[PDB]
């Protein structure tokens, strides 16, 4: 049994109160106060629609993924990744696809910088979408579950779906459950063919083992996954560490 399975078994044993104290212990988070207030008032400029904008910005600012040309955003939700890419200098067009409907987020219309090069489409299940030519492929799909075998199935499904969209392009793909031996086998095959590396985002909660497969980097997948497993296990040991607070992104206004 993997270090990740031991972390998941422990996570599943926590009371709601313990789970609530654990999930944000020692993580990094952006202060969403101003954006939440503005969005409640129906403000359409400056504010990121979700925490997703700051999450993708973390990778982009470290050159792990460099969005350019035609950006495809799979599982765009409210649109955090799409509106962030819309303001990047090398980006020319952003297309977002999301399921929507009961239990899922709907795209939020915004007037942030570069809103005019974005098209968000709801009622779209990516598992039935044929692949499209694109210069950047983004995918944030992976629903958490108390069952690691459910999470493993969801991860393999995403990995099999994304491959036909990968054609020597920039990419950032969520890997919900990267520690199961079957997932590691797929990721290593994918890394040999398309390159890139798996990276833990410090904005991720301790309640998820999610890592992101990004195009610009190299490294040992097994070592990186085991490093995250040891980190998350170690975070059960000590009393709650309040999260490190950072400033949220200002997405500005205007067209391009
Ligand atoms: C983690 S959220 C996306 C957050 C987004 N990156 C942002 O910055 O706002 C993942 C999204 O994928 C959507 N989703 C899940 N399964 C889907 C599917 N089969 N096809 C399309 N969208 C799906 C969910 O509704 C959810 O809004
Ligand atoms: C459990 C959960 C949490 C968060 C959200 C959210 O949007 O932030 C969410 N959304 C929805 O359930 N949306 C929804 C509900 C009914 C119908 Cl007819 C259409 C939609 N789209 C669901």
UniProtKB/Swiss-Prot annotation:
The active site is at 55 (for 2'-o-mtase activity), 140 (for 2'-o-mtase activity), 174 (for 2'-o-mtase activity), 210 (for 2'-o-mtase activity). The lineage of its organism: Viruses, Riboviria, Orthornavirae, Kitrinoviricota, Flasuviricetes. Homodimer. Interacts with host STAT2; this interaction inhibits the phosphorylation of the latter, and, when all viral proteins are present (polyprotein), targets STAT2 for degradation. Interacts with serine protease NS3. It catalyses: a 5'-end (5'-triphosphoguanosine)-ribonucleoside in mRNA + S-adenosyl-L-methionine = a 5'-end (N(7)-methyl 5'-triphosphoguanosine)-ribonucleoside in mRNA + S-adenosyl-L-homocysteine; a 5'-end (N(7)-methyl 5'-triphosphoguanosine)-ribonucleoside in mRNA + S-adenosyl-L-methionine = a 5'-end (N(7)-methyl 5'-triphosphoguanosine)-(2'-O-methyl-ribonucleoside) in mRNA + S-adenosyl-L-homocysteine + H(+). Replicates the viral (+) and (-) RNA genome, and performs the capping of genomes in the cytoplasm. Besides its role in RNA genome replication, also prevents the establishment of cellular antiviral state by blocking the interferon-alpha/beta (IFN-alpha/beta) signaling pathway. Inhibits host TYK2 and STAT2 phosphorylation, thereby preventing activation of JAK-STAT signaling pathway. It is a peripheral membrane protein. The record marks 8, 11-12, 14, 19, 23, 144, 205, 207 as: mRNA cap binding. The modification Phosphoserine is found at residue 50. It comes from Dengue virus type 3 (strain Philippines/H87/1956) (DENV-3). This is RNA-directed RNA polymerase NS5. A motif (SUMO-interacting motif) lies at residues 71-74. Changing residue 154 to A: 40% loss of N7 methylase activity; No effect on loss of 2'-O methylase activity. Residues 1-256 form the mRNA cap 0-1 NS5-type MT domain. Changing residue 176 to A: No effect on N7 methylase activity; 80% loss of 2'-O methylase activity. S-adenosyl-L-methionine binds at residues 50, 80-81, 98-99, 125-126, 141, 212. Sumoylation of RNA-directed RNA polymerase NS5 increases NS5 protein stability allowing proper viral RNA replication. Phosphorylated on serines residues. This phosphorylation may trigger NS5 nuclear localization. It is found in: Host endoplasmic reticulum membrane; Host nucleus. The record marks 55, 174, 210 as: Essential for 2'-O-methyltransferase activity.
